[PDB]
Design an enzyme around this catalytic site. Structure first.
Site, short mmCIF file in Angstrom:
data_model
loop_
_atom_site.label_atom_id
_atom_site.label_comp_id
_atom_site.label_asym_id
_atom_site.label_seq_id
_atom_site.Cartn_x
_atom_site.Cartn_y
_atom_site.Cartn_z
N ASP A 1 -14.60 12.13 14.46
CA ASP A 1 -13.69 11.55 15.45
C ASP A 1 -13.28 10.14 15.08
O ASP A 1 -14.00 9.19 15.35
CB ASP A 1 -14.38 11.56 16.82
N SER B 1 4.21 3.70 13.13
CA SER B 1 5.14 4.60 12.47
C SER B 1 6.54 3.99 12.51
O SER B 1 6.90 3.27 13.45
CB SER B 1 5.13 5.96 13.16
#
Length: 330
Positions: free
Chosen positions: A35, A199
């Site tokens: 994780d 992004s």
């Protein structure tokens, strides 16, 4: 040193991935959910409330000659989906894919939420975010990666998740045979303890690329891709009959649809998520309404590049003094 372990989807939808981990002496192998969005290594154990264990393999520290109670230490964690767990702490030897850390904090669950109990295939989580998020009190503990880092050939790990197939987590090296083209690296903010990056934009299907900054986290422990409502609406508008359902809890679409791809930017590079990766199947058995793999982050407070996005790429988690994230097509 290096390590390399195969990670395997828990079900036919890739709801999560499990990776075998050796804990203790003699080894007790548990299948953990690696994780990158949290920083606790916790396990189902001999201390877990019996009614909250349903098929999981448990860690029994009393059977490990290298286990030691970390006296006074407790932990308690809540994830963004509302899942939770808590307990006390041992140190023990932990190995992943041949890479061994001695004195690793192994957080033994006394309590887990129903969402964990019901996942018989997940024996615990292995956190790979920054150790500043670790929940152990009063002495915060280091992640497996943080403990291993100095011994590694290179201070990196990589996630290569499969679509409806196994994949690989590597520690300490970049497998240059595992991706195509080049790896594009991008800056990381560690201020919130996550692998947080920006992004450069997106495209829907064969549409034109929209240049826009999208801050989010790379989270192998989140199944889906959570993005701003504007972006998500633009995607689903290209699927006839798709709609956001308040009763279901997100976008659904007719199971008869062919889904368009979704592209996200990494610097000047582009990662393409095939449409099939965005199909999470019938909302309930036999339904013709299917659940979407791209959902709004509105009300989460952060965008999340979960497995839907990450499995389309070879992803480098570079834990150098100034961390960065790398993405390549594959």
């Amino acid at each position: 040193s290096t390590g390399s372990a195969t990670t395997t989807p828990i079900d036919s939808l890739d709801d999560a991935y499990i990776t075998p981990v050796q804990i203790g002496t003699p080894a007790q192998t548990l299948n953990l959910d690696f994780d990158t969005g949290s920083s606790d290594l916790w396990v189902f154990s001999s201390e877990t409330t019996a009614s909250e264990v349903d098929g999981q393999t448990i860690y029994t520290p009393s059977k490990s000659t290298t286990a030691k109670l970390l006296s006074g230490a407790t932990w308690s964690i809540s994830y963004g989906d509302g899942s939770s767990s808590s307990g006390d702490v041992y140190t023990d030897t932990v190995s992943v894919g041949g890479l061994t850390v001695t004195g690793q904090a192994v957080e033994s669950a006394k309590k887990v939420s129903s969402s964990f109990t019901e996942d018989s295939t997940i024996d615990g989580l292995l956190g790979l975010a920054f150790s500043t998020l670790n929940t152990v009190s009063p002495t915060q503990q280091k992640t497996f990666f943080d403990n291993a880092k100095a011994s590694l050939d290179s201070p990196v790990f990589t996630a290569d998740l499969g679509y409806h197939a196994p994949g690989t987590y590597n520690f300490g090296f970049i497998d240059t045979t595992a991706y195509t083209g080049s790896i594009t690296y991008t800056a990381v903010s560690t201020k919130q303890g996550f692998w947080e990056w920006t992004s450069t934009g997106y495209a829907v299907g064969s549409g034109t690329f929209k240049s826009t900054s999208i801050d989010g986290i790379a989270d192998t422990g989140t199944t889906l891709l959570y993005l701003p409502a504007t972006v998500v609406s633009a995607y689903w508008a290209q699927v006839s009959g798709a709609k956001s359902s308040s009763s279901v809890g997100g976008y659904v679409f007719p199971c008869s649809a062919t889904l368009p791809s979704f592209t996200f930017g990494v610097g000047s590079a582009r990662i393409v998520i095939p449409g099939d990766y965005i199909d999470f199947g019938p909302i309930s058995t036999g339904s013709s309404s299917c659940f979407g793999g791209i959902q709004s982050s509105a009300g989460i407070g952060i965008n999340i590049f979960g497995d839907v996005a990450l499995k389309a790429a070879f992803v480098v988690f570079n834990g150098a003094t100034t961390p960065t994230l790398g993405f390549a097509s594959k």
